Design a protein around this ligand. Structure first.
Ligand SMILES: *[C@@H]1O[C@H](CO)[C@@H](O[C@@H]2O[C@H](CO)[C@@H](O[C@@H]3O[C@H](CO)[C@@H](O)[C@H](O)[C@@H]3O)[C@H](O)[C@H]2NC(C)=O)[C@H](O)[C@H]1NC(C)=O
Ligand SMILES: *[C@@H]1O[C@H](CO)[C@@H](O[C@@H]2O[C@H](CO)[C@@H](O[C@@H]3O[C@H](CO)[C@@H](O)[C@H](O)[C@@H]3O)[C@H](O)[C@H]2NC(C)=O)[C@H](O)[C@H]1NC(C)=O
Ligand SMILES: *[C@@H]1O[C@H](CO)[C@@H](O[C@@H]2O[C@H](CO)[C@@H](O)[C@H](O)[C@H]2NC(C)=O)[C@H](O)[C@H]1NC(C)=O
Ligand SMILES: *[C@@H]1O[C@H](CO)[C@@H](O[C@@H]2O[C@H](CO)[C@@H](O)[C@H](O)[C@H]2NC(C)=O)[C@H](O)[C@H]1NC(C)=O
Ligand SMILES: *[C@@H]1O[C@H](CO)[C@@H](O[C@@H]2O[C@H](CO)[C@@H](O)[C@H](O)[C@H]2NC(C)=O)[C@H](O)[C@H]1NC(C)=O
Ligand code: NAG
Lengths: 614, 129
């Protein structure tokens, strides 16, 4: 299990910019512009444009509030008039340079519209968002705009009994089948297009009730799925339906410890400036006995692609003679491959679209959407497993250290408004710091990263507002030792400026900078006076930031024992000399000790010169 | 070897509708009960249900419908059939009566009642009039 966050930053001790509109709640949708300087917020009954560099600067505002006759219609359907019967923005996507595509629950009448960016006024397109947007603010939902066409995963109805992964195309509308083999009680988590003869694919991530597994209760299972951008459906069968829909198990577990995380919470696509293949960073929690635990598994796209392209499918079979069981299909697979895209191979066999695929192949995919092979993580284990924390959303920044060693920086939000910064150091997790983003411990519902030159920020939304944080707080570190010991690839010590700087931001010289991810503060170069009355009591204040260090006191060059009657420890860090007399005068030193590898790192926290009067 | 039942009715505009009780056939993943238009705006689109006008059942092989009769009374279409009672540990085949509003195009009003004669001593329904 991952250790405790090395340093805890109170909302008070760091520079965090906040945004909220009075009487406006549920800041669940976040979208930043092309230029990255304008962040758009989708809340309950409102859409805003804020300066992404200072979220507190409100630029534009637009509302989409529900009428009383629509609220009462919703309430008459036994829903909560002042809770669920309101317009929760669920779809906030780029449409053009001059517009956004917006959908809201709208007292259970999913409605879509175009937000005119030049005016920040809605165009009144008033489209029926049934299938595109959920009815209930409680229902799961995911959407990705690909080539001005919305690819959405949510419920097709009011009750949330009909799930749907569909494309609102207008030219070629396509949707999933309303069948258990296709989708079995899913809870949508994330979707994105993975761009390139070879066609683009639109991946979907969700948790659904498993068909392959049987246990005491119904077992959930994380799913990775994909569809082909060029899909047009089948001609005779799969009319207006996906022909390219294949899914597989997403497995996040440490078995030598019986830890299985079968509930997917978030998915982030690490788009490597260097690496040609994207890495999905997926966030999971266990369905069973969650108390709570969180795990972060990283999946190489190539792995998943290997399953969808060459993996054996699963067959459903009748078993004695009213039951259905699912097993590996070892029978003959049709050609062209069921679920495959219109690639170079297909085009050679005179196949231009799904509309001209053989009925043999189309029937196969319709009856075999599920793959036998699981999609496994890189190094076949989670990147991080944490206890006593319920992680909510994830973002990852691939950063180059001073050394040139590349670290994948994990920003993980909690259900209590906190953000953890973690890196997988040499075969062990290091949680650099934790920051309390929300003073009200509101769970971070959404998280969004901008790693772009200048505007390097993380944006977190909750029901109470939005928070803007940098990727590091290098300046909070006082000494070179403190700067190095942090083991943050973002932070380096600058001897000329006598400040711990943010490497890859500051205008300090690279060649003349200090950073050691080993934590060996050895690479570094290197008195509060008091006058108290006789008989009186002294409180010598001492504090440090490491949650992984312990402090001890020293008087007259010896390790002082804070025991009654002469001594006491107030708050485990502040020394208390009780009965002051001639001999108590002199130097009192507060020291810290923290283990890095095998070695211990002692640091002098406080220096005190106590003088007792006569 | 597998029965199909039908019922010709009218829509709200007097248009001709056909209610179908298609029993499960071992591809046949077709909904067990549907409302298909007999003569729509495009006559080439006849015998099609509106994607909404069906009884979506997720595990047809398990329920294994066996239709007997379909009929109407008042503003309702009724269906007589056998299917496995999966609520029972026995998962044994049981006789049922089914009812949907003639106007209901989403099968919202659809309701099933088990039939008993006498306390299931004669469990299998064969015919009715
Ligand atoms: C994600 O999965 C892909 C799929 O294989 C990984 O890519 C491949 O990794 C192998 C392993 O070495 C590469 O093979 C060889 O690399 C050595 C190293 O220099 C080279 O000397 C050999 O001649 C050969 O090239 C293979 O080329 C490479 N292919 C691609 C497209 O990347 C990828 O590394 C995985 N990424 C992660 C983070 O797991
Ligand atoms: C949107 O944001 C608002 C802002 O907090 C959320 O409001 C909160 O709603 C919950 C209920 O869902 C309130 O909890 C209470 O639950 C008990 C249990 O029965 C009930 O008896 C109480 O009357 C109350 O409803 C919570 O107090 C309330 N917060 C505030 C400040 O009023 C809202 O739930 C969010 N909606 C979504 C979809 O996230
Ligand atoms: C989007 O909003 C802009 C903002 O007004 C609209 O711009 C006006 O467009 C008309 C022509 O249609 C011009 O005559 C006005 O002078 C424009 N005013 C401004 C301030 O630019 C634009 O038309 C809107 N787009 C749509 C589709 O409604
Ligand atoms: C969602 O589907 C609707 C259904 O057609 C699309 O609507 C058309 O939109 C185009 C402009 O993009 C208009 O020229 C057509 O006249 C519209 N037709 C109808 C029937 O609405 C809509 O654009 C789709 N939206 C997205 C984001 O894909
Ligand atoms: C982690 O999240 C779980 C829920 O997923 C929390 O468990 C709930 O805690 C509340 C607080 O009293 C209880 O009333 C609920 O009954 C609990 N539900 C379950 C399923 O246990 C858990 O406390 C959270 N723990 C941490 C460390 O975040
Ligand atoms: C932007 O941030 C600065 C930093 O303190 C603040 O002084 C200024 O008022 C903020 N702008 C707005 C509109 O809040």
């Amino acid at each position: 299990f991952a250790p405790i966050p090395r340093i805890t930053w109170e909302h008070r001790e760091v520079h965090l910019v906040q945004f909220h509109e009075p009487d406006i709640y549920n800041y669940s949708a976040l979208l930043l512009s092309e230029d990255k300087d304008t962040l758009y917020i989708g809340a309950r009954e409102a859409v805003f444009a804020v300066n992404a560099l200072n979220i507190s600067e409100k630029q534009h505002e637009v509302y989409w509030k529900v009428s009383e006759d629509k609220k009462a219609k919703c309430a008459e359907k036994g829903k909560s008039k002042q809770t669920e019967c309101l317009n929760y923005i669920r779809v906030l996507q780029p449409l053009s340079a001059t517009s956004l595509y917006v959908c809201g629950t709208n007292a259970f009448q999913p409605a879509c519209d175009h937000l005119n960016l030049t005016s920040f006024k809605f165009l009144g397109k008033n489209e029926d968002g049934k299938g595109r947007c959920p009815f209930d603010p409680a229902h799961s939902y995911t959407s990705v705009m690909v080539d001005g066409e919305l690819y959405s995963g949510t419920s097709y109805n009011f009750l949330g009994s009909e799930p749907i992964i569909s494309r609102n195309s207008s030219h070629s509308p396509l949707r999933t089948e309303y069948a258990i083999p296709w989708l079995n009680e899913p809870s949508f988590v994330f979707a994105d297009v993975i761009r390139k003869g070879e066609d683009d694919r639109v991946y979907f991530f969700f948790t659904e009730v498993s068909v392959e597994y049987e246990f005491v209760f119904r077992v959930l299972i994380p799913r990775i799925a994909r569809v082909c951008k060029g899909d047009q459906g089948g001609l005779r069968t799969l009319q207006k339906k996906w022909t390219s829909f294949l899914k597989a198990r997403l497995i996040c577990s440490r078995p030598d410890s019986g830890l299985v995380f079968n509930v997917l919470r978030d998915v982030f696509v690490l788009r490597s400036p260097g690496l040609k293949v994207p890495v999905f960073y997926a966030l999971f929690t266990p369905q069973l006995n969650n108390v709570g635990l969180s795990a972060v598994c990283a999946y190489n796209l190539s792995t998943a692609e290997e399953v969808f392209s060459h993996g054996k499918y699963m067959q459903s079979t009748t078993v004695e003679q009213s039951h259905t069981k699912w097993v590996r299909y070892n029978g003959p697979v049709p050609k062209p491959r069921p679920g495959a895209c219109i690639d170079s191979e297909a085009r050679a066999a005179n196949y231009t679209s799904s509309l001209n695929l053989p009925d043999k192949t189309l029937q196969f995919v319709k009856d075999h959407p599920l793959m036998d092979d699981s999609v496994t993580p890189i190094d076949n284990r989670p990147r991080l497993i944490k206890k006593d924390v319920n992680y909510t959303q994830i973002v990852v920044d691939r950063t180059q250290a001073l050394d040139g060693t590349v670290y994948d920086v994990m920003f993980v939000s909690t259900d209590r408004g906190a953000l953890h910064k973690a890196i997988s150091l040499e075969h062990a997790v290091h949680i650099i710091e934790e920051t309390q983003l929300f003073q009200d411990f509101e769970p971070v519902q959404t998280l969004l990263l901008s790693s772009k030159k200048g505007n390097r920020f993380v944006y977190a939304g909750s029901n109470s507002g939005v928070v803007q944080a940098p990727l590091a707080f290098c300046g909070k570190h006082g000494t070179c030792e403190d700067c190095v010991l942090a083991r943050d690839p973002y932070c380096a010590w600058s001897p000329p400026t006598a400040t711990c700087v943010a490497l890859h931001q500051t205008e300090s010289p690279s060649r003349g900078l200090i950073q050691e991810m080993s934590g060996d503060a050895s690479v570094c170069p290197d008195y509060r006076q008091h006058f108290f009355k006789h008989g009186g009591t002294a409180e010598l204040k001492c504090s440090q930031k490491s949650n992984l260090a312990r402090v001890f006191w020293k008087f007259q060059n010896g390790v002082l024992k804070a025991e009654s009657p002469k001594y006491g420890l107030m708050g485990r860090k502040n020394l208390l000399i009780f009965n002051l007399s001639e001999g108590d005068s002199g130097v009192y030193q507060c020291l810290s000790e923290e283990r890095v590898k095998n070695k211990t790192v002692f640091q002098v926290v406080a220096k005190h010169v106590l003088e007792v009067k006569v | 070897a597998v029965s199909t039942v039908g019922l010709v009715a009218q829509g709200l505009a007097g248009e001709p509708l056909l209610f179908v009780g298609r029993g499960y056939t071992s591809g046949g993943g077709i909904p067990p009960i549907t409302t298909r238009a007999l003569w729509p705006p495009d006559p080439q689109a006849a015998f099609s249900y509106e994607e909404t006008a069906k009884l979506a059942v997720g595990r047809l092989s398990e329920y294994s419908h066996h239709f007997v009769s379909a009929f109407a009374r008042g503003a309702s279409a009724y269906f007589l059939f056998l299917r496995r009672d999966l609520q029972a540990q026995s998962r044994a085949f049981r006789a049922y009566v089914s009812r949907v509003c003639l106007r209901d195009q989403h099968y919202y009003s659809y309701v099933e009642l088990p039939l008993a004669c006498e306390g299931g001593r004669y469990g299998l329904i064969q015919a009715a009039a």
